[model samples]
Target chain A: RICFNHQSSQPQTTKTCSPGESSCYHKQWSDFRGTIIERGCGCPTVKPGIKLSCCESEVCNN
Target chain B: RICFNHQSSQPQTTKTCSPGESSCYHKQWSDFRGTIIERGCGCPTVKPGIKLSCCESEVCNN
Candidate 1:
């Protein structure tokens, strides 16, 4: 269970990162009504708002 | 700063534990005094005993 900004219904857990750091995440129209309940360090790529989506790992490249 | 349960005046940083946890610390007493400044992982095996202290790095032994 990563912990991100506790705001929207986006399923999240606690993400312990470097001070003033942010984890990566992905958002798909196919996600749950909220965030599909998931957590990752990095994410994938496919246009799907290439703006949000980690590499499914902790730190991502770009 | 690592995020640990916030409480007490004991100097602290931030320690993200696994869901539920309590970090370790080593306290000492000299003469009729108090107020010390130190941060270590484990600590002295003096009769004073240990209390709360992280592994100067992260995570500790016993």
Candidate 2:
């Protein structure tokens, strides 16, 4: 599974997995929903990962 | 005396004076300072005017 490394400001790009199968990473998880993943898969896996870019609609614009 | 017209976004470029004497306009007034005026005088008077522009250091940047 893909996981978010919260220590850094920028989103994590790497995924941890064995050589054979694909893995998904979740960057952000809130109370309401499952882990929010980025649009594209970091690895070749079907599971989506969290998007690390700043939010466009809110004050998070960088 | 100089005054600020709060209705406008850009700082007031004009100053109101009786005739020959100079007048100062204050654009921003806070608790510490009496009134923060732009560097140059709007009119010929000594009274300072307020400066109206986006704040540089904070999130106020447009």
Candidate 3:
């Protein structure tokens, strides 16, 4: 399986999941300037002022 | 492999890395509210205005 991997300021890419990885995560955070999207393998810890979503399919974070 | 996983807003926890995950990451971002620390599996995509560190040992992101 694979997941979308990128930062808001960079070009998007795909990450092949580790054998043990069962999920992909897309996280968004915003400040006065704008919102930032971050995606990668596994579920990241939740944070204040941020929105997080996780999925269990190939390239699900896209 | 295993990594440390947690956010600054919560207590620390450990994550068993996916078979494909070879490293752990600790990232920090700050604004007027101060800094936020996030740790999780794999090398997360780099983001502007953030400081990131990755390691290859068990619980390395700690």
- The backbone clash count of each candidate, in order, is 30, 17, 2
Instruction: Give per-residue CA lDDT, model 2, range A1-62, as digits (tens).
Output: 23333333455444333444222322333336544444222322232322322111111222
Ordered by lDDT, highest first, the candidates read 3, 1, 2
| lDDT tens digits by residue: candidate 3, A1-62 | 68889877687799898898867877777878798888899887775545665555567565
lDDT per residue for candidate 2 within B5-46, as digits (tens), equals: 332245444433344433232233344644433422232222
Higher-scoring candidate on lDDT, 2 or 3: 3
DockQ-based class of model 3: incorrect
Model 2 interface RMSD over true interface Cα atoms: 11.6
- Candidate 1 regions exceeding 4 Å error are A1-12, A15-23, A31-38, A47-51, A54-62, B1-62
| Every prediction: chain A TM-score | 0.27, 0.22, 0.82
Evaluate every candidate with DockQ and list the scores.
0.02, 0.02, 0.02
Off by over 4 Å in 2: A1-11, A31-62, B1-62
**Interface RMSD to the true structure, each candidate:** 15.1, 11.6, 12.4
Chain A TM-score of prediction number 3: 0.82
The sequence of per-residue lDDT tens digits that candidate 1 reaches over residues B1-62 is 12323233564554454433333333433344554334333233434222322322233221
Q: Candidate 1 falls in which docking quality class?
A: incorrect
Candidates sorted on TM-score, descending? 3, 1, 2
